[PDB]
Design a protein around this ligand. Structure first.
Ligand SMILES: CCOc1c(C)cc(C)cc1CNc1nnn[nH]1
Length: 292
């Protein structure tokens, strides 16, 4: 009863010499809602959320470079590669003011973009977003050994690239209900060839955990500082027990982030969109009219 289909016409735009695929539905003009997915997903992640928003608002949901149906350039796929390509995607569409609905590395992208263009963002809805993790102590045990293994050049690449462990292992573990084979196949699709799994490996290696990578730590601290100061309307979805944003961190953020409404989505881990897309979509639709 959670839709497995992806009923959106493909759109492609030429960005820095590569084609990037994106969803584009709703009204053809006006403030768009920009959906940014993270690892190891694609615009597919928003398939059940978009239909709640698209009646009233243009919806745009790109596949990040090297992911989903986007082209696969021979890049190192650092977070900085993702920044360059998303910045260029936004301009290629000539987007002006936007609302962001962001998740995971998409949240790192969203917040980083919002910090650099504060006058162009009308609101931010986020869930399970990237914040600095001071120590492995704070990383949930059930996945601690796994992610520490991910974050090596030898064992980590063997797991993620050669064994597709991020897709076959971490993905379904990040969802409370069991993903169906049909859903898994949509998610496996961009990564059928081991060669195409570079971004899947570099991404966990970019997580700001115990002060490394230093450049990502400083960058994520900068947008966290910007968030605690910014009057931008915020909608924060959180699950129980959650992974990146546990119930107690949500509660704190509700107080320390200005203009921040929170929504309890019930049981949830990493991919909150795969556990309760109905409430996330409906709560976004309810939130939008209050923006403008
Ligand atoms: C407990 C670990 O949580 C995760 C779980 C449980 C599943 C997935 C797919 C991802 C993560 C982590 N998020 C992530 N790793 N690299 N880029 N984003």
């Amino acid at each position: 009863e959670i839709g497995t289909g992806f009923p959106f016409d493909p759109h492609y735009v030429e960005v820095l010499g590569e084609r990037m695929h994106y969803v584009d539905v709703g009204p053809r003009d006006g403030t768009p809602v920009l959906f940014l997915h993270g690892n190891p997903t694609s615009s597919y992640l928003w398939r059940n959320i978009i239909p709640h928003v698209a009646p009233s608002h243009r919806c745009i949901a790109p596949d990040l470079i090297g992911m989903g149906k986007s082209d696969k350039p021979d890049l190192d796929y650092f977070f900085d590669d993702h920044v360059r390509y998303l910045d260029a995607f936004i301009e290629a569409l000539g987007l002006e003011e936007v609302v962001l609905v962001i998740h995971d590395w998409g949240s790192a992208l969203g917040f980083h973009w919002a910090k650099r263009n504060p006058e162009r963002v009308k609101g931010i809805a986020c869930m399970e977003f990237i914040r600095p993790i001071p120590t492995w102590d704070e990383w949930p045990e059930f996945a601690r050994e796994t992610f520490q293994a991910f974050r090596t050049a030898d064992v980590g690449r063997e797991l993620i690239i050669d064994q597709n462990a991020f897709i076959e292992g971490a993905l379904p573990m990040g969802v409370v209900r069991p993903l169906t084979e049909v859903e898994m196949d949509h998610y496996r699709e961009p990564f059928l060839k081991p060669v195409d799994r570079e971004p899947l490996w570099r991404f966990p290696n970019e997580l700001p955990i115990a002060g490394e990578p230093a450049n990502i730590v400083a960058l994520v601290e900068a947008y966290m500082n910007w968030l605690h100061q910014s009057p931008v309307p915020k909608l924060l979805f959180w699950g129980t027990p959650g992974v990146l944003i546990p119930p107690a961190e949500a509660a704190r953020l509700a107080e320390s982030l200005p203009n921040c409404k929170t929504v309890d989505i019930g049981p949830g881990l990493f991919l909150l969109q795969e556990d309760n897309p109905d409430l996330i979509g409906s709560e976004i639709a309810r939130w939008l009219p209050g923006l403008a």
